[PDB]
C-alpha cells in the first residue's frame, strides 16, 4: 500500500492543537525551547501519539459535571470522556484526548443542559492550563465563570474554546506559551506517556510548522500556534495506515496551475516536517498549492535550500 499525503491546501486544512483553520507555513530555529506538543502527533503509518485524537472540534474541549467552589465564581469539572462515558485515568496517556498541550489561559463558554425539563444555560468561562488546579489526568479541571449560582451539579456540562487571554496587559506577548507543556497531573507530579519531543538532526535544517492565529479575547496575548501536522494529515494517516519504507518521505510542494515545484521537505516517520533553511521565515506559497509525496529517501537526504 503506497504512502501519500492528502490533496489539501493550507487554507483548506485545520490546525491540530486548536479548533482553528491553518493560515501559513512558518519555519524557525527551535533551539531555545523544547518542541513537544501532545496534540496533532501522529506517525506516517497511522499510530496516534500523546493526546492526539481524530475530531478537530474536540481539541481543547472538556466534558463532565461542575461543582461550585462556595465563596467564588469558580467551578470544578469532573472530566469524562467525549462519549460522556467515565474517563479512565489509568489509560496509558498523558491526559484525556483533546487536552490543551500548552500553558496559558483559554476563554470559551461553559454550556449546561438540565436532563429533566431540558433547560439550558451558558456562561463565559476561562481555564488556566498552567494553574495548580489544572489536572486533566486526574480528571478534575477548574474553570472561572461569570456567575456563581447558575450551574447545577450532576448535570452534563461542556466547555467550548474560543480564544486565549493575556492576564493584566503587563508584559505583552508572554502568554500563552505554546511550547511549555502544562502539568497534566497538577503540582509536583510530572507527566506520563508523553509524545517524544522533536528536533532537527541534520545540519542546516529546521522545523516546518503549520502556523495559525488563535483568537484573542483580552489583553495582548501571543496568539501564534504552530503544529507539527495538520489535523487532516492525522486523519489521513490514521485512515491509510500505509507502511513506512524509510525514516524520511520526501514531500514536494507543487503548484497545480503550473506544475513547478517550489520547495522540498522531509516528513519523518515519527511525524514532523523538516526544511533546509536557517532563520525565522514565513513561506510565501500559492494559496492553491499542496504537498506531494514522491519517494522514501535517505535518512539524511540533503534537501535543497528553501
Amino acid at each position, epitope marked *: 500500500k503506497p504512502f501519500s499525503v492528502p490533496v489539501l491546501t493550507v487554507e483548506e486544512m485545520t490546525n491540530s492543537r486548536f479548533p482553528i483553520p491553518l493560515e501559513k507555513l512558518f519555519t524557525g530555529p527551535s533551539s531555545a525551547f523544547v518542541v513537544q506538543p501532545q496534540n496533532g502527533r501522529c506517525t506516517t503509518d497511522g499510530v496516534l501519539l500523546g493526546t492526539t485524537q481524530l475530531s478537530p472540534v474536540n481539541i481543547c474541549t472538556f466534558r463532565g459535571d461542575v461543582t461550585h467552589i462556595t465563596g467564588s465564581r469558580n467551578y470544578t469539572m469532573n472530566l469524562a470522556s467525549q462519549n460522556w462515558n467515565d474517563y479512565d485515568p489509568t489509560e496509558e496517556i498523558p491526559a484525556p484526548l483533546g487536552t490543551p498541550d500548552f500553558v496559558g489561559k483559554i476563554q470559551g463558554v461553559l454550556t449546561q443542559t438540565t436532563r429533566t425539563d431540558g433547560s439550558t444555560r451558558g456562561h463565559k468561562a476561562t481555564v488556566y492550563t498552567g494553574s495548580a488546579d489544572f489536572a486533566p489526568k486526574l480528571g478534575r479541571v477548574q474553570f472561572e465563570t461569570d456567575t456563581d449560582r447558575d450551574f447545577e451539579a450532576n448535570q452534563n456540562t461542556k466547555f467550548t474554546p474560543v480564544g486565549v487571554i493575556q492576564d493584566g496587559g503587563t508584559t505583552h506577548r508572554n502568554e500563552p506559551q505554546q511550547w511549555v507543556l502544562p502539568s497534566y497531573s497538577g503540582r509536583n507530579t510530572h507527566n506520563v506517556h508523553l509524545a517524544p519531543a522533536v528536533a532537527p538532526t541534520f545540519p542546516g535544517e529546521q522545523l516546518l510548522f503549520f502556523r495559525s492565529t488563535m483568537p484573542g479575547c483580552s489583553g495582548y496575548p501571543n496568539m501564534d500556534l504552530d503544529c507539527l501536522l495538520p489535523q487532516e494529515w492525522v486523519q489521513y494517516f490514521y485512515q491509510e495506515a500505509a507502511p513506512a519504507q524509510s525514516d524520511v518521505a520526501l514531500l514536494r510542494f*507543487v*503548484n*497545480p*496551475d503550473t*506544475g*513547478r*515545484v517550489l520547495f522540498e521537505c522531509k516528513l519523518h516517520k515519527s511525524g514532523y516536517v523538516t526544511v533546509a533553511h536557517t532563520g525565522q521565515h514565513d513561506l*510565501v506559497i*500559492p494559496p*492553491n498549492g499542496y504537498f506531494r509525496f514522491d519517494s522514501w529517501v535517505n535518512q539524511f537526504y540533503t534537501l535543497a535550500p528553501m
Partner: T-cell receptor
Amino acid sequence: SVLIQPASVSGSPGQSITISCTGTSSDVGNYNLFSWYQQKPGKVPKLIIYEGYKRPSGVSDRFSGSKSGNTASLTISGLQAEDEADYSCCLYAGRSLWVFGGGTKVTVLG
Amino acid sequence: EVQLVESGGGLVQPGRSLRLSCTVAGFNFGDYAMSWVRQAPGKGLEWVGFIRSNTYGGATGYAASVKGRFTISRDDSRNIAYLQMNSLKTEDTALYYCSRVGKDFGDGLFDSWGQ
C-alpha cells in the same frame, strides 16, 4: 484585477526607461508573480522577465524588474533601437487567474 | 523543438459556436498546462483561460469576460488543446494564441506562444 500600464514610454538611445504596472485592491497576499513580455511588430510575445525580477536565458542584462506588492516595474537601461516594441505585464496570484496589462509602446527617441 | 500550431478560426455569426484546436510538438502535452490568450484589434492582450495537467486534477479556469461561455479542454492521445467558444459576441473578434505554462524555471512564465 485590472493592471494599469502607461500607453507609451519614449527615450533616447542609451537612456534608461521605466514602465509601471499598477494593480488594484485585489491584494490576496504575498504571492504576486509579475512577468514582463516583449512583443515586436509581427512577432509573438517573448518572455523577458518572470517572477518579478528573474530573467530567462538569452535575455540581455539590460532588462530588470521589481515588485512592490501590487506595483511591478520594468526597467530598460541603455535603450537601443531594437528595444522599440510593446511590453505587457502579466500578474498571476496563485488562484488560477492570469491578468494582462494594457501594454506600453516603447519607442526610441531621435 | 517546442511548437504550438493553432487552427480552426475564421468567420462565425454572433450567437453561434466555434472550436479552436492547438496542436503541439516537442514535449509531453499531458505534462504542461495550456492557456488561451486573445488579442483584440488594436488593443492589449487578454487572458481567456487555461487548463492544467491531467495528473494534477484536470481542472479549468476562465476569465470573467468569457466565464460560462468558453470551455477549454484537451486530448492527450491526439496531442490537442481545444477551446470551444459558445454563444459568441462581436467583442470576441480577436487573434487567439495558445501558449504553454512551463514548469522548469518559473510559474507564470508563458514560455512559448503559438502563431
